[PDB]
Design an enzyme around this catalytic site. Structure first.
Site, PDB file in Angstrom:
ATOM      1  N   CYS A  46      54.939  31.131 -17.742  1.00 15.89           N
ATOM      2  CA  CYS A  46      54.132  30.089 -17.120  1.00 15.89           C
ATOM      3  C   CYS A  46      54.736  29.695 -15.759  1.00 15.89           C
ATOM      4  O   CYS A  46      55.950  29.794 -15.563  1.00 15.89           O
ATOM      5  CB  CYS A  46      54.064  28.892 -18.083  1.00 15.89           C
ATOM      6  SG  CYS A  46      53.289  27.387 -17.439  1.00 15.89           S
ATOM      7  N   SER A  48      55.388  26.852 -14.523  1.00 16.81           N
ATOM      8  CA  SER A  48      56.395  25.800 -14.669  1.00 16.81           C
ATOM      9  C   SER A  48      57.795  26.370 -14.903  1.00 16.81           C
ATOM     10  O   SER A  48      58.799  25.699 -14.634  1.00 16.81           O
ATOM     11  CB  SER A  48      56.045  24.843 -15.814  1.00 16.81           C
ATOM     12  OG  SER A  48      54.743  24.306 -15.668  1.00 16.81           O
ATOM     13  N   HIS A  51      58.944  27.138 -11.577  1.00 17.84           N
ATOM     14  CA  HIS A  51      59.272  25.901 -10.851  1.00 17.84           C
ATOM     15  C   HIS A  51      60.745  25.586 -11.072  1.00 17.84           C
ATOM     16  O   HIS A  51      61.414  25.062 -10.185  1.00 17.84           O
ATOM     17  CB  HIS A  51      58.455  24.692 -11.354  1.00 17.84           C
ATOM     18  CG  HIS A  51      57.018  24.688 -10.924  1.00 17.84           C
ATOM     19  ND1 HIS A  51      56.565  25.359  -9.809  1.00 17.84           N
ATOM     20  CD2 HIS A  51      55.935  24.060 -11.444  1.00 17.84           C
ATOM     21  CE1 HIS A  51      55.270  25.141  -9.659  1.00 17.84           C
ATOM     22  NE2 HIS A  51      54.863  24.356 -10.638  1.00 17.84           N
ATOM     23  N   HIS A  67      58.949  28.115 -22.528  1.00 16.46           N
ATOM     24  CA  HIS A  67      58.329  27.064 -23.347  1.00 16.46           C
ATOM     25  C   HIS A  67      56.974  27.438 -23.977  1.00 16.46           C
ATOM     26  O   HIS A  67      56.433  26.683 -24.781  1.00 16.46           O
ATOM     27  CB  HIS A  67      58.180  25.787 -22.515  1.00 16.46           C
ATOM     28  CG  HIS A  67      57.291  25.947 -21.321  1.00 16.46           C
ATOM     29  ND1 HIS A  67      57.739  26.461 -20.120  1.00 16.46           N
ATOM     30  CD2 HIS A  67      55.975  25.682 -21.148  1.00 16.46           C
ATOM     31  CE1 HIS A  67      56.734  26.513 -19.266  1.00 16.46           C
ATOM     32  NE2 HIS A  67      55.655  26.046 -19.864  1.00 16.46           N
ATOM     33  N   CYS A 174      51.140  26.591 -24.302  1.00 16.81           N
ATOM     34  CA  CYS A 174      51.017  25.922 -23.005  1.00 16.81           C
ATOM     35  C   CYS A 174      49.723  26.255 -22.250  1.00 16.81           C
ATOM     36  O   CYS A 174      48.714  25.577 -22.418  1.00 16.81           O
ATOM     37  CB  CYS A 174      52.230  26.208 -22.118  1.00 16.81           C
ATOM     38  SG  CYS A 174      52.126  25.385 -20.494  1.00 16.81           S
TER      39      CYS A 174
END
Ligand code: NAD
Ligand code: NAD
Ligand code: PFB
Ligand code: PFB
Ligand code: ZN
Ligand code: ZN
Ligand code: ZN
Ligand code: ZN
EC number: 1.1.1.1
Lengths: 374, 374
Positions: A46, A48, A51, A67, A174
């Site tokens: 993902c 994120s 990030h 995650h 997610c």
């Protein structure tokens, strides 16, 4: 066999930001009271997660990110009731302790036991279960799925359908659930409406899926990467717009296109500027704008409050508004019942050891979702 | 009698901003088709009228301000079917043409014929019905109630109960309906919830009335002027806080006393800082904040979008979310049936000639709502 023993396994550790993940041998301690050790089967990449690498999202380093995943329960700590060894499970980055004010509220899903607002990178008891070269490595969102094995808290795991395809349902950890629920649950997109979606990555396409399932009459996808257009059409978009093709702002273009503004817009990128534009795009008297993208650390946006005073609504949500524990297992069933499709989100499958390649595809804009198999 | 003829009368003309109102003689033209000429009976002093003086709110000058009032139909233009001479009416600053997208939308109330967004200060035909010192004067929001007579378009007027006390129901023209609707209709305050109201003037106390009406369990009034607290307690506030009494920022104070944030907060002042503060003090996962105050022209606020990402909802509204023509008469009826009290909001009643003293009472924090009588 492994039960009660420190496991030595491979995990992708990020020691410094802006560096590649280094597959290392780590020691995963056994689960303490109320914890669960899981053997990973499939994990998605993902934005994120990227990030964290980029420095956009601050969290204690070194860390084992990841995650969005699905695995199998190896052992459980003392006190665990929700699951048992052999169970298929999806780790939940937004926990559901079921005891705090938020968990007790009909619509809040941002459980107070989360490790998102002020990340600590530890277990509920403030300690880590990962060691590398005698150095403790931090957890990520209480999930840390970029590891052959991981230890999560009982409040951060949901047992799922024993017959579910782990290599696909991992998207329910997610990306999918976030996109779908943002349209269906947060924005509560109405039939016949016009929707605008900024960002057409895994989460954005899932937003389009939610809008399409909500009976949206028009779904305009917005991206600077045209190669995303065909796949966007595929999952529901009726038209696709690239801001680079115009001489005027995209808010003007979108307002003209929609005859006064869209009914629902979504920001699925993570940019302050696009968050304001998505707001402006919706009809002034009754439009609704939902922020899905995660913004850069410590950045403040500026906007004219008059955009709201006319009547617009502005909201945001973590994980599409779904209470994790309650929703994940039911979302999986819906998948088993063919109520929606995850297949168009998965563009590449790669073995876990090839994680870095999986992050370059994303950064290059060549993939939507890459699933890493262990 | 005066029908079909120009009327010479007194009106408070604002020639230049930041100067007192000049009570002068003006000529009010007869109504054209679909227009209505009203003899004013009562008009309240709303803070938005003061914003015009300060230049905080931009509208073409010279102008005859005033928008919260009640009067009697003197004559109607051709085609007017909704009202007749002798009828008690409330001019509507937010119109209801009933034909546009907004008007047709079940939730929207910001009719596209409004004169609020791009204020041009004329009638719907581009002209003015006022002449002062031989010059044409601008209308204000299609209302202009600080005049013994005025002309408004039919889409900007509502017929009310013939038995209503105009010296009171004028508050339904703005202050009351805005405060009450913001709580009841916009935020949709839930029974048992905790609310925080920023600003305890005429509109803020009306928000308190709406919160109490929706069944709020706790209503905290926040004002820097402790003289407003008693009246606030009087209309529903359970506690009143004065930011000045604390050595800690107000958002922490409110968050601590609410055990993690309020369910609903309202900004009813018109400041960029209190708007962000009001947002902050509402529970991060499910709180809702409604902006009711008018911000200074062309000013942007700065905020961290993460405040929204956790699950907060931010919204603003004009005239309490009420579709004007449909609501005002029902609001008047309810008032007649003792469903709410307006008396607590009226602190002073002055004759029209003392308009300037009226605006001084407001600026001094000495009054809540002052009603000027003609
Ligand atoms: N709210 C939540 O719970 C939650 C959940 C998952 C992801 N996220 C966030 O959602 C965002 C998207 O994640 P993803 O996994 O779908 O990402 P992604 O990288 O797959 O997709 C981002 C897309 O936006 C496009 N884009 C980038 N800049 C653009 C611009 N300036 N204008 C128009 N289009 C632009 C990109 O080309 C890309 O297609 C990220 O910020 C991520 O951190 C939040
Ligand atoms: N949205 C709408 O339709 C609408 C309708 C009517 C009025 N308004 C706006 O609502 C706001 C309030 O109007 P009103 O007529 O009740 O005004 P008011 O002058 O009676 O003001 C309300 C209160 O704000 C307080 N205040 C000022 N600064 C403060 C601060 N920093 N902290 C705490 N309290 C502070 C004052 O002491 C006052 O008691 C204005 O901006 C007005 O223009 C909007
Ligand atoms: O008080 C209502 C009100 C006004 F009169 C204005 F002129 C204005 F611009 C507003 F936004 C208002 F809410
Ligand atoms: O993708 C969801 C997500 C994360 F992983 C984060 F780390 C985070 F801070 C978020 F806000 C997210 F939405
Ligand atoms: Zn994610
Ligand atoms: Zn909880
Ligand atoms: Zn007003
Ligand atoms: Zn209309």
């Amino acid at each position: 066999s492994t039960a009660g023993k420190v496991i030595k396994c491979k995990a992708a550790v990020l020691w410094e930001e802006k560096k590649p993940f280094s597959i290392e041998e780590v020691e995963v301690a056994p689960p303490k009271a109320h914890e669960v050790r899981i053997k990973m089967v499939a994990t998605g990449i993902c934005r994120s997660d990227d990030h964290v690498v980029s420095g956009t999202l601050v969290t204690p380093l070194p860390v084992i990110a990841g995650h969005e995943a699905a695995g199998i329960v190896e052992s459980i700590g003392e006190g665990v009731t929700t699951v048992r060894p052999g169970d298929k499970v999806i780790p939940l980055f937004t926990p559901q302790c079921g005891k705090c004010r938020v968990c007790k509220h009909p619509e809040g899903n941002f459980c107070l036991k989360n490790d998102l607002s002020m990340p600590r990178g530890t277990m509920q008891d403030g300690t880590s279960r990962f060691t590398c070269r005698g150095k403790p490595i931090h957890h990520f969102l209480g999930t840390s799925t970029f590891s052959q094995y991981t230890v999560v808290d009982e409040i951060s795991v949901a047992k799922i359908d024993a017959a579910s395809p782990l290599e696909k349902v991992c998207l329910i950890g997610c990306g999918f659930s976030t996109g779908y629920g943002s349209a269906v649950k947060v924005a509560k997109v109405t039939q016949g409406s016009t929707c605008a979606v900024f960002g057409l990555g895994g989460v954005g396409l899932s937003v389009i899926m939610g809008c399409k399932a909500a009976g949206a009459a028009r779904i305009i996808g917005v991206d600077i990467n045209k190669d995303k257009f065909a796949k966007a059409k595929e999952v529901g978009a009726t038209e696709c717009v690239n801001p680079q093709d115009y001489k005027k702002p995209i808010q003007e273009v979108l307002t003209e296109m929609s005859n006064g503004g869209v009914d629902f817009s979504f920001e699925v990128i993570g940019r302050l500027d696009t968050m304001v534009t998505a707001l402006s795009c919706c009809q002034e008297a009754y439009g609704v704008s939902v922020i899905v993208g995660v913004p850069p650390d410590s950045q403040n946006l500026s906007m004219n409050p008059m955009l709201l005073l006319s009547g617009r609504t502005w909201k945001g949500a973590i994980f599409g508004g779904f209470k994790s524990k309650d929703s994940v297992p039911k979302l999986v069933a819906d998948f088993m019942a063919k109520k929606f499709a995850l297949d168009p989100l998965i563009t590449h499958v790669l073995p876990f050891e090839k994680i870095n390649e999986g992050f370059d595809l994303l950064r290059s804009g060549e993939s939507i979702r890459t699933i890493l198999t262990f």
